[PDB]
Amino acid sequence: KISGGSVVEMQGDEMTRIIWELIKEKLIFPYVELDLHSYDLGIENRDATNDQVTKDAAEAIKKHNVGVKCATITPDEKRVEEFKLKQMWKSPNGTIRNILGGTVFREAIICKNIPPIIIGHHATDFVVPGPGKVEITYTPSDGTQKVTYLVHNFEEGGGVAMGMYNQDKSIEDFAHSSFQMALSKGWPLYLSLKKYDGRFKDIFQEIYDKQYQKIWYEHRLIDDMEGGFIWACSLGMMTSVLVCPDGKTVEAEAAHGTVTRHYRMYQKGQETSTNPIASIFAWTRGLAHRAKLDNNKELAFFANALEEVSIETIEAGFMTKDLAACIKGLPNVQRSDYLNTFEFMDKLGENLKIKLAQ
Amino acid sequence: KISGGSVVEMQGDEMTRIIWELIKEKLIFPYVELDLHSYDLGIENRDATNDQVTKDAAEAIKKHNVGVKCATITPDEKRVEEFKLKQMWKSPNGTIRNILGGTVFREAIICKNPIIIGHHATDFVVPGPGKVEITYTPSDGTQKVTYLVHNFEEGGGVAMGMYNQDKSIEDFAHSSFQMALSKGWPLYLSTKNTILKKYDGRFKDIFQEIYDKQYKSQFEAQKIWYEHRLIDDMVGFIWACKNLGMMTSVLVCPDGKTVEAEAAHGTVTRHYRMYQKGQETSTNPIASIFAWTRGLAHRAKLDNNKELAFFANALEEVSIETIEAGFMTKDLAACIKGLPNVQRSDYLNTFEFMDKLGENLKIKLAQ
Ligand SMILES: NC(=O)C1=CN([C@@H]2O[C@H](COP(=O)(O)OP(=O)(O)OC[C@H]3O[C@@H](n4cnc5c(N)ncnc54)[C@H](OP(=O)(O)O)[C@@H]3O)[C@@H](O)[C@H]2O)C=CC1
Ligand SMILES: NC(=O)C1=CN([C@@H]2O[C@H](COP(=O)(O)OP(=O)(O)OC[C@H]3O[C@@H](n4cnc5c(N)ncnc54)[C@H](OP(=O)(O)O)[C@@H]3O)[C@@H](O)[C@H]2O)C=CC1
Ligand SMILES: Cc1cc(Cc2ccc(O)cc2)n(O)c(=O)c1
């Protein structure tokens, strides 16, 4: 068995929780040993501990550099009645992301028989009661000049206004994180309010020509945008990853939520078909990054090999129902076209046993 | 021939000009008489009269309530070279949309082989450390209220200001409420007023205030409604959002009376450079067509014109069923079979397809 190493892991809620534990038992644990830092971010325990588990996991990823997350219920009032929650806890994803910072990257996992691009996305509001000038001024620390611009002269009635700012560090971190991400994937990077979006274009060209393999970098405009490049700005085949600026810290996760409807059938006793692929690839991306930080040739191999098996299994006709309805059309799907949740996991395990045996 | 009424019409540029005249000669004029208020918004005539023609149309739509516009070249430096323009004239749409006001509505046209969305700046660069503030100074010399946008203490960056008046927000409501009632469709407003508690909050409220004071009645009167949402949770309805040869843009004035319609695609220059060269083209008229039927059907409503209203409805159907039965342009055939696999016997060119819509409009109307 591979010594993978130190990996933070957060468990979730409902249907993705069922799949999380399956992934560990049929795909991960049987081939890899981890010095595992589990945190139980299920809604019940988050409530029980006063969203404390959530803070504890986040600091761990800050400490051990690698996190993989199971999808988690975010509370609104309907949930608060359901779990009798003592408060309406903020999303753990929000909680975690502030503590760690960085930029998210959503990659669709591409299968060859279904209908890659990595997109990475990146204030003072008030009420103007009645008429009057609303201006925005800038006064440098060395008291040399006062530059004041007029946002609008309210002559009509009143209304609403707002202010928005931005420091260089934040944009430099968009750049670093985006250029670094381009080399890890070996893909070209593209970057898509005359003077606002302009300041973005520059710091990119400046970090590019200062630190940053048969690769390059370019700029564009929204509407101007074969497939296989990094772009800076079924669901169960989406994989978002939060990349911290330093380049060391990484958190991986499914891009879908907890699939409650499938879980409600699971409870009722009915047969389901939840796509594990998103949650799966959350693990392999985190494991492969662990491998990078540790120069772990054995592990790195395993990570890629499991990403392989997953794609080859669907490419071979064995798949779940969300994928079978994407190929054939929902109303035209027969039961012998897809596998259920527990059978598709069996096939991957069987193909992972064989693929890894050779 | 049906008595249509008072309708402003503006001719456009390049390929949309070719298709436009095909629409009038082969689909509209042969069945409908209009008191026609043509204005020629071609880049030349706009140049020649000093974009005057453009202003004349706006006040014309402002007067007669119903307008249909053909896609029109917007000048950039390159265009000024081609035509030797005397100036780089503002978009005709920019001009016209200022004079009339209202809210644009883009509706995607569904072929079986719909959502109506209607959407709603001062930026500068912060060189080095220092405070950027945004202030409010009332007209009645009362206190001046100062908010701090941010104190940059390390280095620089960027900042910006953004506004919105109530008149602006109140006109968003109506234009969105009118369009929902015209369509017998439910209305949803997607704000982001969790983050922006005081900004979009003003949006969310002014919407719930208009709903009651005037529109809760008539909404139940068509078993329809209105609700508010937040962007990601919103993920046959009218969608208001605080922010291709089958796309149809329509400007709804708040009053409910004035309406200007047009295809959402541009002048299709590439196909036109082929047209000039003498080569065979294949451009989609449905959008340009549907502009007419939205403006004609709006005309019919204001005037109790069952004859016109049917005809409008009848033509829109002809367009959709003509494609739903397999006769289409190349952009649509490339949607079905994939771009690299498109054979010529899959699609019709511009002049064969207009023929087919015309033929089908003869038989349909015969019934
Ligand atoms: N912490 C996190 O990472 C996130 C958490 N959430 C949470 O999800 C909870 C409710 O789930 P909800 O947002 O409504 O539903 P989902 O976000 O999980 O996805 C909605 C629909 O997409 C389909 N879907 C998504 N993933 C899969 C999959 N692996 N296999 C098959 N189908 C899939 C299902 O379609 P179908 O109808 O066919 O069954 C599902 O009903 C919320 O309480 C919210 O807090 C939301 C977003 C991310
Ligand atoms: N005043 C107005 O109403 C508007 C004016 N414009 C002006 O149009 C001019 C040029 O527009 P441009 O952006 O280049 O072209 P378009 O915006 O119209 O679209 C360009 C391409 O999109 C495809 N396309 C769009 N509509 C159709 C259609 N009906 N049938 C088939 N294909 C279509 C074509 O691709 P393909 O080549 O592969 O076939 C076409 O070459 C500009 O100067 C611009 O200012 C732009 C928007 C509205
Ligand atoms: C100049 C201009 C153009 C459009 C339409 C448009 C279409 C395609 C495109 O790529 C960009 C603009 N409108 O609506 C305006 O008010 C003003």
From Swiss-Prot, chain B:
NADP(+) binds at residues 72-74, 79, 266-271, 284. Its main location: cytoplasm. Disulfide bonds: none annotated. Binds 1 Mg(2+) or Mn(2+) ion per subunit. One of its GO terms (cellular component) is extracellular region. The modification N6-succinyllysine is found at residue 356. PROSITE patterns: IDH_IMDH. It is an enzyme of class 1 (oxidoreductase). Mn(2+) binds at residue 232. The record marks 192 as: Critical for catalysis. It is found in: Cytoplasm, Cytosol; Peroxisome. NCBIfam families: nadp_idh_euk, PRK08299.1. Catalyzes the NADP(+)-dependent oxidative decarboxylation of isocitrate (D-threo-isocitrate) to 2-ketoglutarate (2-oxoglutarate), which is required by other enzymes such as the phytanoyl-CoA dioxygenase. Plays a critical role in the generation of NADPH, an important cofactor in many biosynthesis pathways. May act as a corneal epithelial crystallin and may be involved in maintaining corneal epithelial transparency. Belongs to the isocitrate and isopropylmalate dehydrogenases family. This is Isocitrate dehydrogenase [NADP] cytoplasmic. It comes from Homo sapiens. The gene is IDH1.
